[PDB]
Subunit: 89 residues, 4 copies
């Protein structure tokens, strides 16, 4: 993967992040680890490794936000079903 | 997060996937778990949960590909440095 | 998997956490999302879903900490 | 962390793997990326980097398997 391809990948993943933060009732702190890295698309002189790390944090964070959203919606129904079966013992 | 927002997120993550597969020397099997799910952006009638799952697999896979790419480039230099220090004992 | 097997997996992953936190120069905050969940091995009456989620946050936190360490050794 | 601590973490994560694979109706292929790496606890002469990577693939594989199971219980 070339450096210009990685910069373009990082630019688009930041477009995904902004898209996500624009949604209804989303976790606005989801990307806090990516922000700690302070490696951004415009930092064209930083290393291929720093940019790979930033894309890693973005992908990872998007997946963790999907997981949290599921564990807190369907996970709740599951917890409730389990509580009801218990009750029905 | 509304269903139309999640479909739009899934559509864009598929744009990221296609972007990545277009790069130089990339792992073309990186998204094999997302393809097993067979949940796609055009499947507008499938559940919010199936779409969240598909975005999870895409984010996760992009991050795993960054990890593999790093473990196989910088990881190699690190392994080699460690081998040389050993040698220098 | 059965609930007893999952509580046992959660107990062992907490053993992994305590082992990692006992290592030299490690990120002591690596598991902060798991602590936010407040679902622990001893909470035997909480849901299978709450426990699967806690095992998810522990596995994920360990892999994140290995990645940070690898992305940082590389500089 | 030191190499001996990392080999010990890798040994325990392999204990977690074997424990999970011993559970009822689990995904027996969950750890296939770790097997592709072929870096095991007994490979004491392989690099710290090869071992961090194997712990990464085991943590990640466990969290992926918890997620699959949660995304699938939800249907
Ligand atoms: Ca910044
Ligand atoms: Ca398909
Ligand atoms: Ca607690
Ligand atoms: Ca092997």
């Amino acid at each position: 993967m070339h450096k210009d391809e990685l910069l373009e990948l990082h630019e688009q993943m930041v477009n995904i992040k902004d898209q996500f933060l624009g949604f209804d009732h989303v976790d606005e702190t989801a990307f806090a680890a990516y922000e700690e890295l302070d490696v951004e698309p415009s930092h064209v002189h930083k290393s291929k490794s720093e940019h790979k790390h930033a894309v890693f944090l973005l992908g990872n964070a998007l997946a963790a936000a999907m997981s949290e959203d599921e564990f807190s919606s369907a996970g709740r129904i599951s917890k409730r079903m389990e509580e009801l079966a218990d009750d029905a013992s």
